Point group: D2
Chain length 121, copies 4
Amino acid sequence: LGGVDREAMARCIEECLRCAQACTACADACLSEPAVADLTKCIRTDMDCADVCTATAAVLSRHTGYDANVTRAVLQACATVCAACGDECARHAGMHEHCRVCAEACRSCEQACQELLAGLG
Amino acid sequence: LGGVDREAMARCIEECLRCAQACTACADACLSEPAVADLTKCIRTDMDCADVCTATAAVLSRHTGYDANVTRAVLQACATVCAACGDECARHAGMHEHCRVCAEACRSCEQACQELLAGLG
Amino acid sequence: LGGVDREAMARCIEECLRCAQACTACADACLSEPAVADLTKCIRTDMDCADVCTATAAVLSRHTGYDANVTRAVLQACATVCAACGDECARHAGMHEHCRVCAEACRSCEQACQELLAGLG
Amino acid sequence: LGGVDREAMARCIEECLRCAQACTACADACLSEPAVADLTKCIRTDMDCADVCTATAAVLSRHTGYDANVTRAVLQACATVCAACGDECARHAGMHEHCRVCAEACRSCEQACQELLAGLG
Ligand SMILES: [Cu+]
Ligand SMILES: [Cu+]
Ligand SMILES: [Cu+]
Ligand SMILES: [Cu+]
Ligand SMILES: [Cu+]
Ligand SMILES: [Cu+]
Ligand SMILES: [Cu+]
Ligand SMILES: [Cu+]
Ligand SMILES: [Cu+]
Ligand SMILES: [Cu+]
Ligand SMILES: [Cu+]
Ligand SMILES: [Cu+]
Ligand SMILES: [Cu+]
Ligand SMILES: [Cu+]
Ligand SMILES: [Cu+]
Ligand SMILES: [Cu+]
Ligand SMILES: [Cu+]
Ligand SMILES: [Cu+]
Ligand SMILES: [Cu+]
Ligand SMILES: [Cu+]
Ligand SMILES: [Cu+]
Ligand SMILES: [Cu+]
Ligand SMILES: [Cu+]
Ligand SMILES: [Cu+]
Ligand SMILES: [Cu+]
Ligand SMILES: [Cu+]
Ligand SMILES: [Cu+]
Ligand SMILES: [Cu+]
Ligand SMILES: [Cu+]
Ligand SMILES: [Cu+]
Ligand SMILES: [Cu+]
Ligand SMILES: [Cu+]
Ligand SMILES: [Cu+]
Ligand SMILES: [Cu+]
Ligand SMILES: [Cu+]
Ligand SMILES: [Cu+]
Ligand SMILES: [Cu+]
Ligand SMILES: [Cu+]
Ligand SMILES: [Cu+]
Ligand SMILES: [Cu+]
Ligand SMILES: [Cu+]
Ligand SMILES: [Cu+]
Ligand SMILES: [Cu+]
Ligand SMILES: [Cu+]
Ligand SMILES: [Cu+]
Ligand SMILES: [Cu+]
Ligand SMILES: [Cu+]
Ligand SMILES: [Cu+]
Ligand SMILES: [Cu+]
Ligand SMILES: [Cu+]
Ligand SMILES: [Cu+]
Ligand SMILES: [Cu+]
Ligand SMILES: [Cu+]
Ligand SMILES: [Cu+]
Ligand SMILES: [Cu+]
Ligand SMILES: [Cu+]
Ligand SMILES: [Cu+]
Ligand SMILES: [Cu+]
Ligand SMILES: [Cu+]
Ligand SMILES: [Cu+]
Ligand SMILES: [Cu+]
Ligand SMILES: [Cu+]
Ligand SMILES: [Cu+]
Ligand SMILES: [Cu+]
Ligand SMILES: [Cu+]
Ligand SMILES: [Cu+]
Ligand SMILES: [Cu+]
Ligand SMILES: [Cu+]
Ligand SMILES: [Cu+]
Ligand SMILES: [Cu+]
Ligand SMILES: [Cu+]
Ligand SMILES: [Cu+]
Ligand SMILES: [Cu+]
Ligand SMILES: [Cu+]
Ligand SMILES: [Cu+]
Ligand SMILES: [Cu+]
Ligand SMILES: [Cu+]
Ligand SMILES: [Cu+]
Ligand SMILES: [Cu+]
Ligand SMILES: [Cu+]
């Protein structure tokens, strides 16, 4: 905060919550496929991307005693995992609608994290 | 799942994520008030309501090997905490806009949990 | 708090953290089995039991403006899910060491939750 | 995984769970001090360090489709926040025992993250 883009922050928080949920729902949807054995990296990466988006949403929602070093590090982590997860689910976009929808959510939240991170100094 | 209201489920998941975030933001907004000393139960209850809504959103987002006993217990917990937190922040609705907004989110998600729980058998 | 068993509380918090981790590790260990297709309810229940134990540990770690109604509801949820997950992984105790170890952690934390819940009035 | 130090990994997971809990307990203990108004950055940083340690413990507990890029990014975030939080609570080590205990937990988990991160390539 201070010279930050408040609208870029709100987008990042909203995209994190959306993306955590998409990833949780994708993990579960894949567990239910008969194809489950071939979708285990996707499921694992989804579990991670949901955990990190959850944490990132909470970190970014707070302004008291804001420390840009913590914020940048957390946004970096979230961008890195959303990129990994985006590609991972994108692999199954032609197999399952859940994975193409989740791939879009990862990429969208990767963009939101990157956009915010850049304007943090 | 099975005879469940899919739209009541989606509302519950959306309201949980909205409410977790509102509560996290309220906790932080109160930490920043000069009035902080008088707002410590509100801050604590917000932290709890954010933790439980987070968990509830994730539990309700999953359908593989669904167990209605776990689901009902988790929805019960989330309703109970949203009721407690709703009243707690509602106390400061005439002091801070963050608390009146958060009070509405708690009550809204309390309703969503109760509505879903009722149709689970 | 007030007439509560402080040692029963500490056990509950410690068992929750242990159990969240055991469940996360079990979920992942099962995703890696060649048997994964037959272990999907176990994996799902593990994900839920890790989420609820995480939340319960945090709720129980807090004493400011303690509300026994929220605490009991949250402990109830955690006991219910640990019971479900205990039985679920116990099914694979003769197939995988991870599931027999995780089954013991669920049962242990089910006991800790039940013991605490009983002395809360 | 592969050329990784399995004992450094277990330490990191254990220290994260310990540290998440210490931070949650410190946040709450500070909310209860009469001194609360002067301890608001400590409380905020504790909330963040608990969220990130929670996520890090879960990420590090998983081996299926392991991606060292995600793992390093997440460990980096966790080290950065534990360093920030260590110093933040260390400021009140002569005021409250909870803050000196929590400061030690942050520093300990900062070390565990840094040690692991270094051997990941
Ligand atoms: Cu975000
Ligand atoms: Cu995200
Ligand atoms: Cu996601
Ligand atoms: Cu999926
Ligand atoms: Cu998948
Ligand atoms: Cu994902
Ligand atoms: Cu994510
Ligand atoms: Cu994120
Ligand atoms: Cu992300
Ligand atoms: Cu993904
Ligand atoms: Cu996929
Ligand atoms: Cu996926
Ligand atoms: Cu999917
Ligand atoms: Cu898929
Ligand atoms: Cu995704
Ligand atoms: Cu995904
Ligand atoms: Cu993602
Ligand atoms: Cu994402
Ligand atoms: Cu993001
Ligand atoms: Cu972001
Ligand atoms: Cu909900
Ligand atoms: Cu909620
Ligand atoms: Cu809320
Ligand atoms: Cu507030
Ligand atoms: Cu408040
Ligand atoms: Cu709340
Ligand atoms: Cu809530
Ligand atoms: Cu909820
Ligand atoms: Cu709730
Ligand atoms: Cu509230
Ligand atoms: Cu309030
Ligand atoms: Cu509040
Ligand atoms: Cu507020
Ligand atoms: Cu307020
Ligand atoms: Cu609220
Ligand atoms: Cu609130
Ligand atoms: Cu609430
Ligand atoms: Cu709520
Ligand atoms: Cu709700
Ligand atoms: Cu709900
Ligand atoms: Cu517990
Ligand atoms: Cu537990
Ligand atoms: Cu467990
Ligand atoms: Cu397992
Ligand atoms: Cu399993
Ligand atoms: Cu479990
Ligand atoms: Cu559990
Ligand atoms: Cu628990
Ligand atoms: Cu439990
Ligand atoms: Cu289990
Ligand atoms: Cu199992
Ligand atoms: Cu299991
Ligand atoms: Cu297992
Ligand atoms: Cu197993
Ligand atoms: Cu278990
Ligand atoms: Cu288990
Ligand atoms: Cu369990
Ligand atoms: Cu458990
Ligand atoms: Cu328990
Ligand atoms: Cu417990
Ligand atoms: Cu760790
Ligand atoms: Cu940590
Ligand atoms: Cu900590
Ligand atoms: Cu503290
Ligand atoms: Cu503090
Ligand atoms: Cu901390
Ligand atoms: Cu931490
Ligand atoms: Cu950590
Ligand atoms: Cu850390
Ligand atoms: Cu700290
Ligand atoms: Cu402190
Ligand atoms: Cu602290
Ligand atoms: Cu403290
Ligand atoms: Cu202190
Ligand atoms: Cu600490
Ligand atoms: Cu601390
Ligand atoms: Cu810390
Ligand atoms: Cu830490
Ligand atoms: Cu650490
Ligand atoms: Cu670590």
